[PDB]
Design a protein around this ligand. Structure first.
Ligand code: A1AV9
Ligand code: A1AV9
Ligand code: ANP
Ligand code: ANP
Ligand code: MG
Ligand code: MG
Lengths: 270, 264, 270, 264
């Protein structure tokens, strides 16, 4: 119970420091590139193109879903994936890679992965903006139902960090987890409504019921409801909201407790 | 006579496993007890105000561990240490990114310590003037020489005002003029009643820098006292060790190693 | 013309050094893992499982191809992909990452990426062996047509290195190429017979004719012919053999010339 | 009187761009000519057999660049240098992987130089005995102190027999007993007619180590000669610089910087 309060106080006190360190890391990782920070917008976009050529043109024969063209249906759902994947992959190695340079320095060690995640959120936001701007050419204009983003965009962030704060510590104790993570995330990608929609009423009905436990399902569907479908998502699916809030709370509690228990003995393990 | 730093029974152990896979054995069930190495053992220290204290000892004695414990990057296994102020430590390789330039490194370092951007821009010209870097302040740090990097780090640390300053062989790469400038700065800091710890393997620099001497041999404080008392004993011990034959030196080192390691 | 001879002499003279350095790098990259070098066999296998659950069970409804079960059809074709992808991705950053530690050292700089590739080939070989061992449970036993592997397994290697020797130098001059490579390889993965077979006689006929220019097509088809189909592959498709040999020669020539021209000015660029 | 190393008109320039994006401008079309910095300019050197030559100069003079040019890790812009043998260079931070242990580091280093495994296993005990590392040879290198790492690197380099040996401030971290042992090894190497270059900022170590002195000031060889002739001039220059006021020191540094930079 003291670990949660300690971590919350550390994060609340160092908000601006976290923001500045994330802004500096963004420049650090894009040092020698000629285009600069433009790659943060170029690297995901190309991937989207590939995912439209394979799963949109090849499979599905470019058939629309729910009265919406498949291109924008994929565009809305694919936006958060790059941020989530990159944040989870890089936050697991944040403490291990950058321990010596910060062991001498005097700032809380629980905010090290967080600003790493904050180094990617920026880019996600930019992409999101473009997607909305790209949605007006079909005839889809912003409505009141977009205010729901104020609840949905933060939650995704609060998910990713909640994972990393755990997986960083679990990465220091056992080094094999960094190899297992790459295997897990792929399963979280293909078993999601990002590229396909299950049909139910058969062997895919069990798949549909099992997919609801994936937190990516809720984020993608909520984004689509806010931007595309013009629907208040929380009126029909508040059970998913409560389940995901509980998942986030459990992850945060376990991560904080484990981080505070093994914080002193980091040097012996690493 | 203000007690700057007080250390009472500081003791540090390290767990040694020959195989990398034995780390998990003692972490999941607490019944395992492996071999341990005493990096420090029963160190008691009292550093007053306006004091320059020099740590002496052969390689592997435990001076860097004590300096890090004073700084705070390490936590003693048994015992406590209290400091009346803010400490800063400079080492043989400070924190400077090779890809970054001088200005980016400066702003990174002063952002980590918690300074606003206007304060950073106001304090930058003093660092620029003290470093004597010139045009190369705009060039990347990887283009610097070792002395230039040491000057930049020392100026960054000096510009902010610490209550306790620790130097751990940082001046070895710097030349004589930089040493004289650092000596003048140390005199000014002594006038400001700061506490300075100085570690070096150059005995002339220790003589012209320090005023009190702490001698560490195998993790144990052999002697603490004034410069004129402790330093001649250390020099006599060095000459006596030079006199001894190779077998005697090997036996002495083996005895120290036997004392330091224990299975518990 | 002198660059090709110089690079060939450097590689021929330092064969055992390359092997030993690759063996040391294999141990270096698997230092703190508890399982050790077993992950070199565990990391790809899991991926294969995912690729069987999505494209085999979900799509295609587990339908056999050419009288062979889809599981082994995918197993034979997926084996080389991990080696090719990892070698091309890590060899592009070999000179940039490890320049300072080798600038002082005195050995040829053209053999630096090669042993990096050799750090992965080992693992590939192991996987290949298991695949053959896994093929006997269906009823597919080794035949004379397996001797073709003696021509086909080396060629893939001679392909990957031939790419890296170029992309390393192109990586030093321009840093953006390391970001472009990740975009290219995905296109080389999905437009390949690794997961699907085109139908032709339509809009996929142009796709089928365009896929023959991909060198992965030849490697996958040759492996399947050697192991599964019991067929002398070079009797019907010697044009593809000649085209791929020409591609490899062109890549090697351009890479050697560019490496020798800019070798002296590496420190100024990096 | 065997000419060990000969250097005739060695000159080194570096291209300075304030912006990182200006590198490609001069690489695709050769009409561009930017500002350049003369790291060295018209250096002529003659090192005979059985000579200990010490390089002296203030920070940024160009001693490390000359040592690397002699070693071969750098290529002069104009001029040539010929060596009658095999050279080896030790620096302030040699090649030692932190994750690897001592034995793995030893086998890596002797594999890079081209020794068979049986030769490596035969030569390992000599390195073990010379390093005085003991149990810690089995521990990872990251657990070592700076002096222990320096001892391991020096022993690795010494065990193999080089015709020319270059030391670039490597002994600064080592203590006095290690310095005496290195002095004995240097005497033996002088008896074996090897050529040793020694760089250090400790003038007593230079006096007790070297026999000839080369003075480098701003990339130009001010004076080459015997120890007893060149060293007093350098000391007198240091004292005179200490005498000068801050403005005069700044003017002198600015004049050197003006001389070194040129737009061509
Ligand atoms: C069509 C297709 C099936 C379907 C398939 O092959 N199936 C599944 C059920 C049975 C049927 C068959 O047996 O033929 C597949 O699986 O992967 C594909 C991948 C991996 C593909 O990447 C790229 C294309 C593609 C892109 C653009 C254009 Cl213009 C044309 C093509 C593409 C199509 C398929
Ligand atoms: C079936 C399927 C289509 C087909 C699809 O959706 N299509 C294409 C033409 C029109 C039709 C449709 O509109 O429904 C797809 O595209 O991706 C998928 C992904 C990305 C999938 O990952 C996992 C499964 C899966 C795995 C195991 C089991 Cl037991 C069950 C499922 C899976 C199925 C599909
Ligand atoms: N993480 C560690 N695990 C085990 N042993 C360690 C660790 N860190 C340091 N040591 C040992 O602790 C002892 C003291 O090291 P150290 O304090 O750095 O020496 P020192 O006093 O600085 N002498 P010097 O080489 O001149 O710096 C040495 O024997 C080290 O090998
Ligand atoms: N790659 C580079 N590009 C530009 N300038 C460089 C580069 N490498 C070194 N320099 C400069 O060349 C000069 C000579 O450096 P260096 O030879 O390391 O000094 P030094 O003689 O070793 N003095 P010290 O600091 O005691 O080592 C310095 O002004 C460096 O900044
Ligand atoms: Mg130390
Ligand atoms: Mg130097």
């Amino acid at each position: 119970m003291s670990a949660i309060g300690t971590v919350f106080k550390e994060h609340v006190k160092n908000f601006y420091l976290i923001q500045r360190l994330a802004q500096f890391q963004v420049k650090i990782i894009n040092h020698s590139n000629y285009l600069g920070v433009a790659w943060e917008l170029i690297n995901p976009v190309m991937q989207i193109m590939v995912y439209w050529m394979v799963f949109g043109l090849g499979i599905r024969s470019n058939a629309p879903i729910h009265g919406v063209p498949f291109v924008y249906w994929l565009l809305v759902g694919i936006s958060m994936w790059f941020f989530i994947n990159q944040g989870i992959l890089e936050g697991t190695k944040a403490i291990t890679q950058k321990f010596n340079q910060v062991s001498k320095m005097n700032f809380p060690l629980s905010i090290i992965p967080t600003y790493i995640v904050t180094s990617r959120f920026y880019g996600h936001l930019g992409l999101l903006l473009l997607v909305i701007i790209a949605c007006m050419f079909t005839g889809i204009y912003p409505s009141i139902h977009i205010i729901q983003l104020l609840i949905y965009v933060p939650f995704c962030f609060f998910l990713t960090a909640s994972v990393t704060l755990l997986t960083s510590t679990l990465g220091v104790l056992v080094r094999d987890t960094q190899m297992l993570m790459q295997a897990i995330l792929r399963i979280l990608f293909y078993f999601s409504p990002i590229l396909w929609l299950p049909k139910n009423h058969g062997i895919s009905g069990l798949i549909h019921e099992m997919m609801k436990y994936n937190p990516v399902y809720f984020i993608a569907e909520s984004y689509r409801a806010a931007i595309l479908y013009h629907e208040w998502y929380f009126m029909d699916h508040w059970k998913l909201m409560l389940y995901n809030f509980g998942i986030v709370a459990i992850f945060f509690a376990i991560g904080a407790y484990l981080h505070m228990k093994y914080r002193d003995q980091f040097a012996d393990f690493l | 006579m203000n007690v700057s730093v007080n250390i009472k029974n500081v003791t540090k152990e390290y767990r040694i496993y020959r195989t990398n896979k034995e780390r998990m054995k003692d972490a999941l069930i607490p019944k395992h007890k492996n071999k341990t190495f005493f990096a420090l053992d029963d160190i008691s220290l009292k550093a007053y105000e306006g004091d320059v204290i020099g740590l002496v000892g052969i390689n592997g004695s435990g001076k860097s561990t004590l300096s890090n414990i004073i700084g705070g990057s390490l936590s003693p296994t048994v015992g406590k240490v209290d400091r009346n102020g803010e400490v800063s430590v400079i080492a043989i390789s400070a924190g400077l990114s090779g890809q970054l330039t001088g200005i980016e490194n400066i702003e990174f370092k002063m952002l980590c310590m918690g300074f606003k951007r206007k304060e950073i821009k106001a304090m930058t010209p003093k660092i620029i003037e003290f470093s004597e870097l010139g045009e190369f302040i705009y060039q990347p740090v990887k283009k610097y020489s070792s002395g230039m990097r040491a000057k930049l780090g020392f100026s960054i640390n000096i510009t902010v005002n610490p209550d306790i300053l620790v130097i751990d062989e940082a001046l070895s790469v710097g030349d004589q003029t930089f040493a004289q400038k650092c000596l003048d700065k140390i005199y000014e800091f002594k006038e400001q009643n700061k506490t300075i710890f100085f570690v070096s393997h150059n005995l002339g620099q220790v003589r012209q820098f320090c005023t009190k001497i702490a001698w560490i041999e195998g993790g144990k404080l052999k002697d603490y006292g004034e410069l004129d008392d402790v330093l001649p004993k250390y020099e006599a011990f060095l000459n006596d060790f030079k006199k001894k034959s190779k077998a005697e030196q090997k036996e002495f080192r083996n005895k120290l190693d036997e004392s330091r390691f224990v299975i518990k």
